[PDB]
Amino acid sequence: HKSSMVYIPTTKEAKRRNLNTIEEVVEKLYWTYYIHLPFYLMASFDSFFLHVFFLTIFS
Amino acid sequence: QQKKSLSPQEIDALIEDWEPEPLVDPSATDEQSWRVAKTPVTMEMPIQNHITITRNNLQEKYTNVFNLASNNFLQLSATEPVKEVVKTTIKNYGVGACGPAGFYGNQDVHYTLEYDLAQFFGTQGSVLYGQDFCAAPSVLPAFTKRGDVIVADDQVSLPVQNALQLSRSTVYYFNHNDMNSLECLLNELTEQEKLEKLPAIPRKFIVTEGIFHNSGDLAPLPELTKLKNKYKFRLFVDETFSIGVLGATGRGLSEHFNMDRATAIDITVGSMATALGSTGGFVLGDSVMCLHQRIGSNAYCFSACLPAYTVTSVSKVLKLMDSNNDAVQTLQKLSKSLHDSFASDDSLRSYVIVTSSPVSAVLHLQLTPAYRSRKFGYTCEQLFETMSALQKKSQTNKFIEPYEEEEKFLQSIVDHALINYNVLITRNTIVLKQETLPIVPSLKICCNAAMSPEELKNACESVKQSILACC
Amino acid sequence: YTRVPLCEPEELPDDIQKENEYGTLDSPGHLYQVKSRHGKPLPEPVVDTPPYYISLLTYLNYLILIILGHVHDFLGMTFQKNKHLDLLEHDGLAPWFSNFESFYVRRIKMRIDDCFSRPTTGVPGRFIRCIDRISHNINEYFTYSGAVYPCMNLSSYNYLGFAQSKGQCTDAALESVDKYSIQSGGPRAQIGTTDLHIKAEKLVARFIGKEDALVFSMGYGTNANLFNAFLDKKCLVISDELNHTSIRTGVRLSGAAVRTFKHGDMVGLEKLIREQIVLGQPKTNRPWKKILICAEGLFSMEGTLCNLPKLVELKKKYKCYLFIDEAHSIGAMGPTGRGVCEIFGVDPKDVDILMGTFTKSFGAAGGYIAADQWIIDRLRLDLTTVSYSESMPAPVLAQTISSLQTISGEICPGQGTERLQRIAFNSRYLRLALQRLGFIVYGVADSPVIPLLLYCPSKMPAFSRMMLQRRIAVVVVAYPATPLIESRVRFCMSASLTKEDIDYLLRHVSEVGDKLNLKSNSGKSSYDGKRQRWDIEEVIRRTPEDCKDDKYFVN
Amino acid sequence: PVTDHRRRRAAAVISHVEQETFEDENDQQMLPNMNATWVDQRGAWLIHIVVIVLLRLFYSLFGSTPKWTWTLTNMTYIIGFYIMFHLVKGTPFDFNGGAYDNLTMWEQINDETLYTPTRKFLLIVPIVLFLISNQYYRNDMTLFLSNLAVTVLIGVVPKLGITHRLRISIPGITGRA
């Protein structure tokens, strides 16, 4: 039984098998939970999230 | 002068006292059941010129019956080249589409036919529909809401009537093919609209038909185009019976008058089953119109895609019609001869009349009002007013005796010719309850491009003698 | 490049094509038989909810989208007008459509429009071929290239695998074409009717279990042009809030009064029936001429069944009428395939009118209505489609007759039962595995539609694109079709798929969901009242044996 | 006319929306509105508190006096709620034929029911916000008067038993029936 179908190898399983995960996870959490994909040209809204710099300074 | 003004125990008494009505009234079923017993049924052979039929539950059978009750005109779908395309598609695509329009439903043959229609009919785009009966009431409501104005003819068909009821807008009627009535009506509407000083201009439309389904007349397009531009209106034309039979090649009503469709007409509704030979329908227009129909039309959004073999066959027919135009010429010669054979007879002047144009491929016959009043003793104006009152009052039973007598008489004319001379001619099939505008019974004789002039001539003489003998 | 290419068919040996359209079973242990509920009523369904911050984030995202959309519209249409010439008056003529009535399509859906209207080619079997396209501007126009790649099918209405180009049905259709042409003369009243129409009607009436039935060309027209035949402005219609648009259009054309009751709430229905019987018509308080109840068999967006015995006893007690739609239930539900009536054991005589469609299971196009003798005899004279529309073509009739005969068992023995067992096992296994992984899955235990909830709006395009990159086809729906909080992905199972394909899909879906953090289960899905975060290997090893047992499903 | 479906624009100082006819009311309002159903749902009541807290924190990040911060947050919340609910008239998607073209979202809540718990909550929030906020600028009478005027004239008068289906032709000829 043979069919004309191509199987895509899975990442982390026979793709990478043959220090950076934390940054990727943090980036995904920041991006997907906020409204960015249905926006066009509005990547400048990330500049509005400069509150991290404002709260960085203490006393 | 203020004037001085229930228990749960008696609530169940009201419930028990309720007496509902039957779902369907069976009182008049027996008297009106002769229509089913007289419907011809073809036996194991395609509907063509010569057929073998059985009627009334296989009780009677006829062999080699000349057919004059088929809506197919060009007869190009029974040829060998089309059958080759149909069989190949089934082996490679199947029979079903299995999906809506927006969910993996287009199989890159639906796109091709859309391009072909625009190039053949000289427009910018087209949209396909599953059924022709559900095309007009699905496009008109999408472009009209409350507060709009629609001007319509007084002889439109039932599917057009359904669209105007669901459109939810003001509807006006003008006389059948009367530009004096149309021009007068438009002038008053414009003036009062200017007087009220509305913040925005509402949408306005004109509704008519190319060749009428119940009469067989035409529309004067050159007059309508001048008025719509003068008074800032829009034109809506239905061309179910006028595409493929009018014009040098068969483009439609615009080619007959030597005009351009891109400017004369705005919305065109057509059917692929009358002449092309495949199921479905289409709507023609510009680009902005089409994009709104992809999401604003209920029939398009909420239905499965049309099968594949129907689309492929029509494209082959359109290609064949472009190269050669011999099928249309044969059809027009027979149609003109048929009309003159029934209009130049002095023995049928006092009995029946003809209400069809020479360019029409279907001949309509109606009884003269003098003869109808002599025997049945009723008038069309009286018939219209009786049914209007019943519909408004919402009566369960809607039965009229003089109307039934005329239907039986016309059936006798049909039956007499078939038994004695083996010629099948049909009778107009309508439902009087659903109608809103006046209508009367009639007869129909059809024609196509596969006939011979000698055979048609003998059939015409037989029907003429059949009418005289019955009367 | 801009126009859609016409793909030349490929040349392949027969066996490869058969495997592409229909799979071959590996072991006889992947089949399940469906039992019948004699006296067990349907319990009230239970739903699960995510934590609060998901809802709060969704609300904030929608608020931002609305604010920026309205601001952009106002600023763009005030500071410039040359580009927006389709939304302003020109030479004294109003525009085609309005600005406010089409805000969502232009301002939210247009940025993710690449996930809708995907062109395909070939038979829609186990593997569906798709044409590639390149997005330009922001989903404005596309450029196509001559390349076609296969994808796993989870987005097509093919339950029993009847969409094949090699079999008895295709040969029957070709023979029908040889005998009867594709031409149809006209309306069924004039010339359209033939003997095959009578054969199909009688066979359908015998199969369903009623006395007689009719056939139509379009499913939409069956509902749109039916209610005006026996309803008027002095009748009441009680319908669920979740019904198809065809029923609503038909009732609107009829003109009867409409009152709706909440989904899955019989007490409210009884209260409404009592109040409407007592009060009567408005402004006059005369009694209603008749009362009709409308309902649907299986609801596709949720995969839940209607409670039939309750409706039957209510209509018998209060002297009402019942109307049942079986678009998604015929030929795929029950021990044999009769519908929900066979599932519940209710005799078909109780239901006044039955309806169905041949597109979802039998691989054709059409519809039917089944009722008693006198009702059909009157409706034949009183209907509009019969004497004003076209007639059904012959190949579709041949396909439908062959499919119904095959499922009944007259021809091709030992095929229909095997297909039904395959689809039942596949649905149960997929639902149980998805619930064990940690997701949220709606519906009854055996339902071909599996809705998976994806709450945040930004997670639909990402999931769809990642699944497409891994050669799996999915369908996503969102507001306003679904509630604002709940947006879902719908899975349509087939009898042509195999356990290996399910394992492949499960692995890829699990890893993608772990990447996107879509696992939110509150423990009410598990029958033991505990959270379930398992491994993929353990689920694959244990679920197929435990899939058959019915004690692992809450509903 | 055979249908007589027109929209009237009668001009008067005080006018009301006429009651809907049988066809428009008993038949064209049957399906869920999908514009006011989301109010009585999950998480539809804490979001106002979250918005208030976020606005207050955003203003405090600037580093201004408490009086200006609280006055600005009150005005912004009330103006935003007014713009969202009371100003616009209609619905962003076609319903049946344009049945809800004369009413705002506030009138459409709970099928034109006058007193429901959500309406009580929506009326209660501005008052409690005003009582909490006034404690910082009691000394300045002008700011107190301005806050009281904003609250009473925008966040109190529209949400009343009176002024239901009430239109004034001063800023434009309104449409009724």
Ligand SMILES: C[C@@H]1CC[C@@]2(OC1)O[C@H]1C[C@H]3[C@@H]4CC=C5C[C@@H](OCCC(CO[C@H]6O[C@H](CO)[C@@H](O[C@H]7O[C@H](CO)[C@@H](O)[C@H](O)[C@H]7O)[C@H](O)[C@H]6O)CO[C@H]6O[C@H](CO)[C@@H](O[C@H]7O[C@H](CO)[C@@H](O)[C@H](O)[C@H]7O)[C@H](O)[C@H]6O)CC[C@]5(C)[C@H]4CC[C@]3(C)[C@H]1[C@@H]2C
């Ligand atoms: C310096 C400071 C900074 C801070 C700040 O202040 C300044 O910054 C400022 C920034 C400001 C915003 C800027 C802009 C908007 C959008 C606006 O609008 C919403 C959308 C529409 C809302 O719904 C209406 O519209 C329905 C439409 O159906 C109407 O429906 C009926 O009437 C139908 C009539 O047919 C009949 O069918 C039926 O009877 C029935 O359906 C009904 O009246 C009503 O519901 C209204 O607007 C649209 O509709 C207009 C008309 O079509 C468009 O066209 C018009 O604008 C074109 C522009 O080029 C010009 O050509 C022409 O004037 C003309 O064509 C316009 O573009 C377009 O926006 C609502 C206000 C808001 C948010 C402002 C708030 C205040 C600020 C936040 C200020 C903030 C505080």
Ligand SMILES: CCCCCCCCCCCCCCCCCCCCCCCCCCC(=O)N[C@@H](CO)[C@H](O)[C@H](O)CCCCCCCCCCCCCC
């Ligand atoms: C950094 C600057 C400051 C940032 C702050 C910005 C302003 C926030 C202030 C708070 C505003 C009040 C908060 C109450 C709302 C709570 C959360 C609700 C979540 C969203 C709900 C979505 C509901 C969808 C229903 C769809 C519907 O039916 N829609 C319409 C027709 O019916 C409504 O007409 C429509 O929705 C409102 C249209 C209003 C258009 C806004 C125009 C304003 C342009 C921007 C100008 C600034 C405005 C703010 C001062």
Ligand SMILES: *Cc1c(COP(=O)(O)O)cnc(C)c1O
């Ligand atoms: C799926 C479905 C339809 C679709 O019918 P078409 O044949 O695609 O027009 C119609 N009605 C109901 C109730 C459905 O579930």
